[PDB]
């Protein structure tokens, strides 16, 4: 195969809690995509924006490999 | 009159009105004793630099107040202003009216603006003084009754936001712009009335012609969306009217029912359903319903409240992935709501998502003992297959929690099942890279002479890992 | 001597009276939490005090001696201060706790008047790792590890002492009626809790800021080491007890994500003077100013009072009417009123579904308390 392969390392970034904070960052990157969150905060509290972000992230196709290592949950 | 009382102290200061850079306020002047006379007059020497000068006034260590601006070639700056504005803001009615009429008798500037463009009309709207408002509206022009401030708040916005009703009625009879919107928020007076929960103001606003309940805002939220903050009275006032878009959608597609459900409070949802016009199966831009939000947020009490005694479809799935709300309950470790959903009659446990994903597979991945116990007790098939046909035993082996497959061992699950590649679970167990998860299968005396589609065997699997 | 017994009875009576006058469910829960958290570590620390005392004289290396010296000095200051502060009367307790450059101030950053601190040596000893048993015996390494354990337990103990003292001061000054001082102690308690939590468990332990996981990993490494171990039967038992205790305390600390309710309500939206009441009555006088504040009524946690509203002048009218917006969370709200610089007074309670609140009830109560008939 290829010696310069980080498949084991890529499995670690999907399991490390520090890299799970990076998974929060991409979840935090949705603030630019959708600007309706703050108004939802004033009406349904802070949990509304978090729920909308989680639904937007999890609406797409689910990947088995990503879910196995534990970065699918948060 | 006003802040002028016998025995107080008066101090003045000046500043440059600079629109680009920060200025500096001069040292406060000498103390001036207050006596029978109240309104002073200040003789201002001509500025050498030809600039406008802002004047600040302070009373006996209270918070300073801006009292006016003077041009370079203006003398005899009378301090009669900022007292009519304070008189209109007086919480008392008779005293404020007397002060207003006395100051107007001596030439008070109606058009003077204080507190970021707020004229005397805004001050009277905030205080709710009906007499001075009627006197002003008796002789006035429409250009000043609809004049917004720096933030875009017209007098009607201030009147609606403060809960006053009589002055709102007066402006309605006189005739003012109702659908005016603020800056950066585009909120109508209906939005402000609904966000706080005032019923009389809402009734007075709807008494007027030329007004729409379904007016939008910057993000597309109607006043009915803002009525969630109001508990019961304002929502009933909304539902009492004639034309209401109960199922109005925002930019993202959210409905007031979605907002009520996501906020985790049932009485508002019951009141909204009392209108018998709410579409429960309303979807979002990603095909997300209220039950999906309840499942993803764990609101189990509201989940029971909405699932029973109602004609609700629990098989609705999100369009991108055909993934149901029970899958949401399984994910993120929500065992109790998922267990309740499984026992429901109108819930399909065998529903499949994109890629042939079943709730049992995700329960195995998440390693929830209680959900798997419900799976065994109900009688769901254990040999579910996916598009790529990984068996539940395969996923239990691949999961981060090996101790699942052990209790799967006694259930009769076949350990010789193969995926598209002709590799046994033991072959795939060596490739993942988990050590202790394979010892619990080696003690079962599993065959060691099986070949996959590419030819590898278990000794090759541990060679690339180091088990 | 009889005076020696009399003094100890003074101390015990003062302690009982102090732990009796301050009655509130908030202190009940906080005291229960702190006692169930400290009991075992306090008992084992008292048991090992003499062992550490004999450890102190066993260190001879110049490189490591300052670390143990600093730890011992901090421990002596801490327990001497606790012994001195335990037996004082409630008023003396308040005066000693509330003083510039006090014991609490020294405890917040874990220093002493004689420039002794333990957090920096605790981090330094972990940074290089003298506790590893390089030699077959490495007795000094065992002593250094024992000192590290002592320092960690003392740091947890001072955390919990600070927490309970701040909670007691806050509730005492809330019951007395001093809103400003209760607010400042509330803020201090929240800040010290947050800082100590960040110091023990770290903000996501990305940089291993926390010291609990560091000592846990050091103990795991020395346990896994076999040649470095001394084979003694008691070593295994004591490291097992340390691992169990540290895991339990870490779970207890990580169990809570907040100590008090930091949510802030919304004050009145509009104020008027509707009732025709001339105002040579009560505290309502001409030339005075009135301020209002709101709070969440919580029976289990500590709430926060909103910032005082803009001053309202009193002229010819006494009893005002306040229009209250509907609460988002649907909670009952306590209302406080202050005149000028006088002590704030609780004036009543408002329900989520009622707006027009009239401040006339407390005036009757004050009228009935007037010394003049």
Residue numbers in the entry:
A (entry chain B): 21 to 94
B (entry chain B): 375 to 841
C (entry chain A): 95 to 467
Quote the paper:
The potent neurotoxic venom of the black widow spider contains a cocktail of seven phylum-specific latrotoxins (LTXs), but only one, α-LTX, targets vertebrates. This 130 kDa toxin binds to receptors at presynaptic nerve terminals and triggers a massive release of neurotransmitters. Each monomer is composed of an N-terminal four-helix connector domain (CD; residues E21–D115), a central helical bundle domain (HBD; residues S116–K350), a short β-sheet plug domain (PD; residues Q351–D453) and a C-terminal tail of 22 ARs (ARD; residues I454–G1195).
The architecture of each subunit of state 1 has a characteristic G-shape and is similar to that of the soluble α-LCT monomer and the δ-LIT dimer19. The four HBDs form the core of the tetramer with a central ~12–15 Å channel and the ARDs extend to the periphery, in a four-bladed windmill-like assembly. The tetramer in the prepore state is assembled by stronger interactions between the PD of one monomer and ARs 1–6 of the clockwise neighboring monomer and is further stabilized by weaker interactions between the HBDs and PDs of neighboring monomers. Interestingly, in the prepore state, the CD is sandwiched in a pocket between the three other domains of the monomer and completely avoids interactions with neighboring monomers. We observe significant movements of the HBDs and ARDs relative to each other, inducing conformation heterogeneities and symmetry breaks in the potential four-fold symmetry. The prepore displays a high degree of conformational flexibility in the curvature and/or relative orientation of different subunits and domains, resulting in “breathing motions” of the central channel. Moreover, in the prepore state, the helices of the N-terminal CD are tightly packed and protected within a groove formed between the HBD and the ARD-tail, with helices α1–α3 being fragmented, but stabilized by a conserved disulfide bond. Direct comparison of the cryo-EM structure of the N-terminal helices α1–α3 in the prepore state with their AlphaFold2 prediction in the pore state suggests that these helices undergo dramatic conformational changes to assemble the TMD: In the prepore state, α1–α3 are isolated within each monomer, with a distance of ~60–80 Å to each other, and are bent into a total of five shorter sub helices (α1a, α1b, α2, α3a, and α3b). A stepwise assembly of the tetrameric prepore can easily be rationalized by the involved subunit interactions, which are almost exclusively formed between the PD of one monomer with the AR domain of the clockwise neighboring monomer. The tetrameric prepore is well resolved in this region and shows that the introduced VPRG residues are placed N-terminal of the last β-sheet (β7) of the PD domain, disturbing the crucial intermolecular oligomerization site between PD and neighboring ARD.
